[PDB]
Design a protein around this motif. Sequence first.
Motif, mmCIF file in Angstrom:
data_model
loop_
_atom_site.group_PDB
_atom_site.id
_atom_site.type_symbol
_atom_site.label_atom_id
_atom_site.label_comp_id
_atom_site.label_asym_id
_atom_site.label_seq_id
_atom_site.Cartn_x
_atom_site.Cartn_y
_atom_site.Cartn_z
ATOM 1 N N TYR A 1 26.402 63.533 16.541
ATOM 2 C CA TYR A 1 27.044 64.245 17.625
ATOM 3 C C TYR A 1 28.433 63.675 17.847
ATOM 4 O O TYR A 1 29.003 63.886 18.904
ATOM 5 N N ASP A 2 29.003 62.980 16.857
ATOM 6 C CA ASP A 2 30.359 62.408 17.023
ATOM 7 C C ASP A 2 31.469 63.461 16.850
ATOM 8 O O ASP A 2 31.326 64.354 16.028
ATOM 9 N N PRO A 3 32.565 63.377 17.599
ATOM 10 C CA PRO A 3 32.697 62.518 18.796
ATOM 11 C C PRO A 3 31.807 63.078 19.907
ATOM 12 O O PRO A 3 31.775 64.292 20.117
ATOM 13 N N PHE A 4 31.061 62.210 20.577
ATOM 14 C CA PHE A 4 30.147 62.638 21.627
ATOM 15 C C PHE A 4 30.846 63.435 22.748
ATOM 16 O O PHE A 4 30.321 64.457 23.208
ATOM 17 N N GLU A 5 32.022 62.979 23.170
ATOM 18 C CA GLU A 5 32.740 63.655 24.254
ATOM 19 C C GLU A 5 33.178 65.069 23.880
ATOM 20 O O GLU A 5 33.250 65.941 24.730
ATOM 21 N N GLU B 1 26.017 62.836 32.758
ATOM 22 C CA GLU B 1 26.901 62.431 33.846
ATOM 23 C C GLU B 1 28.344 62.248 33.326
ATOM 24 O O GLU B 1 28.549 61.588 32.303
ATOM 25 N N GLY B 2 29.321 62.881 33.987
ATOM 26 C CA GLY B 2 30.737 62.798 33.595
ATOM 27 C C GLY B 2 31.283 63.877 32.648
ATOM 28 O O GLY B 2 32.509 63.928 32.458
ATOM 29 N N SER B 3 30.405 64.728 32.069
ATOM 30 C CA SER B 3 30.773 65.806 31.083
ATOM 31 C C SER B 3 31.977 66.639 31.419
ATOM 32 O O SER B 3 32.806 66.917 30.547
ATOM 33 N N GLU B 4 32.040 67.070 32.675
ATOM 34 C CA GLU B 4 33.143 67.878 33.160
ATOM 35 C C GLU B 4 34.486 67.411 32.628
ATOM 36 O O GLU B 4 35.298 68.223 32.225
ATOM 37 N N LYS B 5 34.690 66.098 32.593
ATOM 38 C CA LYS B 5 36.001 65.531 32.311
ATOM 39 C C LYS B 5 36.441 65.680 30.854
ATOM 40 O O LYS B 5 37.604 65.466 30.556
ATOM 41 N N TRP B 6 35.534 66.071 29.960
ATOM 42 C CA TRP B 6 35.869 66.239 28.543
ATOM 43 C C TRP B 6 36.243 67.700 28.217
ATOM 44 O O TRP B 6 36.788 67.974 27.129
ATOM 45 N N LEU B 7 35.989 68.620 29.163
ATOM 46 C CA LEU B 7 36.253 70.042 28.964
ATOM 47 C C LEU B 7 37.650 70.272 28.441
ATOM 48 O O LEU B 7 38.581 69.675 28.948
ATOM 49 N N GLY B 8 37.796 71.143 27.439
ATOM 50 C CA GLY B 8 39.078 71.339 26.740
ATOM 51 C C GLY B 8 39.352 70.535 25.486
ATOM 52 O O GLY B 8 40.344 70.804 24.798
ATOM 53 N N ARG B 9 38.502 69.546 25.187
ATOM 54 C CA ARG B 9 38.676 68.704 23.995
ATOM 55 C C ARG B 9 38.560 69.595 22.783
ATOM 56 O O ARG B 9 37.614 70.374 22.664
ATOM 57 N N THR C 1 37.301 60.721 9.491
ATOM 58 C CA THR C 1 36.268 59.912 10.133
ATOM 59 C C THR C 1 34.866 60.314 9.687
ATOM 60 O O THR C 1 34.034 59.450 9.405
ATOM 61 N N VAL C 2 34.605 61.619 9.641
ATOM 62 C CA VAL C 2 33.297 62.141 9.248
ATOM 63 C C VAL C 2 32.969 61.721 7.811
ATOM 64 O O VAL C 2 31.844 61.271 7.525
ATOM 65 N N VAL C 3 33.959 61.828 6.920
ATOM 66 C CA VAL C 3 33.805 61.418 5.508
ATOM 67 C C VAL C 3 33.515 59.913 5.380
ATOM 68 O O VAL C 3 32.573 59.519 4.687
ATOM 69 N N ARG C 4 34.322 59.092 6.051
ATOM 70 C CA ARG C 4 34.153 57.621 6.028
ATOM 71 C C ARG C 4 32.732 57.247 6.486
ATOM 72 O O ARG C 4 32.052 56.454 5.838
ATOM 73 N N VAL C 5 32.283 57.848 7.583
ATOM 74 C CA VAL C 5 30.926 57.611 8.118
ATOM 75 C C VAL C 5 29.814 58.144 7.216
ATOM 76 O O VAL C 5 28.734 57.566 7.159
ATOM 77 N N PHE C 6 30.045 59.262 6.546
ATOM 78 C CA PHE C 6 28.996 59.840 5.693
ATOM 79 C C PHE C 6 28.877 59.045 4.377
ATOM 80 O O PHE C 6 27.769 58.818 3.905
ATOM 81 N N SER D 1 37.569 75.015 17.207
ATOM 82 C CA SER D 1 36.983 73.674 17.120
ATOM 83 C C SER D 1 35.480 73.685 16.886
ATOM 84 O O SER D 1 34.979 73.009 15.984
ATOM 85 N N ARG D 2 34.761 74.439 17.706
ATOM 86 C CA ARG D 2 33.309 74.420 17.635
ATOM 87 C C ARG D 2 32.845 74.798 16.234
ATOM 88 O O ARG D 2 32.125 74.039 15.603
ATOM 89 N N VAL D 3 33.292 75.945 15.736
ATOM 90 C CA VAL D 3 32.769 76.475 14.462
ATOM 91 C C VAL D 3 33.174 75.590 13.268
ATOM 92 O O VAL D 3 32.399 75.350 12.349
#
Length: 319
Positions: free
Chosen positions: A196-200, A210-218, A228-233, A262-264
């Motif tokens: 689920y990275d990045p979690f935010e 708790e706190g989710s609201e503040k990440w809206l728009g990322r 990052t995803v490649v390095r971690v995989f 972003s999502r897709v």
Amino acid sequence: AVDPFEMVRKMGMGTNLGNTLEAPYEGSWSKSAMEYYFDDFKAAGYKNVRIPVRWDNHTMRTYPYTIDKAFLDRVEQVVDWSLSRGFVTIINSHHDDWIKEDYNGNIERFEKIWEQIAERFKNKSENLLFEIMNEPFGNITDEQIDDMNSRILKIIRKTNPTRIVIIGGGYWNSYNTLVNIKIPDDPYLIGTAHYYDPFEFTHQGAEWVEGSEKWLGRKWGTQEDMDTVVRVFDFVKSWSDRNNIPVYFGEFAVMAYADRTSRVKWYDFISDAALERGFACSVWDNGVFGSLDNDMAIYNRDTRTFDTEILNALFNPGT
């Protein structure tokens, strides 16, 4: 009796039956399990179904910690639907947080659950896989997680000599943790993480965080995001190679609150990266479209349709 690395092949790309049987009682959250979901999943091209199961409210809280026959029947019925269609099918214990909060007090009961699960499903096809514990977090220690995996695995092997068991570690089955678990000396095992990275980003506006609201728009999609995803995989693939154990990404998803490009993209890139390296996958899908609060959805169980754009990203290479 089947090599884990072939099973991970056969598993390919798949889905969770989210918020269904892992709710306190089935139907209290998303809609109860129905035979037609499996027809649809098949037609969509998923090759596996992970089935979360919360055993807590269907299991006695005093000795001998029996599971309600009725509830095992119900689970056997849903599993059977899955196996009938040729899915790699996975049952687990999910949201059974009582064992995470007091490992010492409760381990007797958890042992008993898994003794009985192991018994009921002893004769199923090799495509039924046991997964010991979804997302350890909190009070339970790494030591205790290692102890559990070894313990429970032993109980399973009494009646299921060769069925593949799936194990992970702490911090919500993080990959950081997977890489450091103590692998029991058993040849029929697969390791799992949840990505689920990045979690935010992935959890922006999730109402239960708790706190989710503040990440809206990322947003998500930069060069560095992808690197990052490649390095971690790579890092996970190395662990897989070193320890000769296949890797399974049992969950990944993004809140529908997320910017649509972003999502897709995120779904696309994670799938393409995991599958490139021979990882099995099951996408998280909770079937919730309103409010956006609670939306990590692909399949609508009422209209019997899929977010096709996302579905395509799971199975196809992007660019």
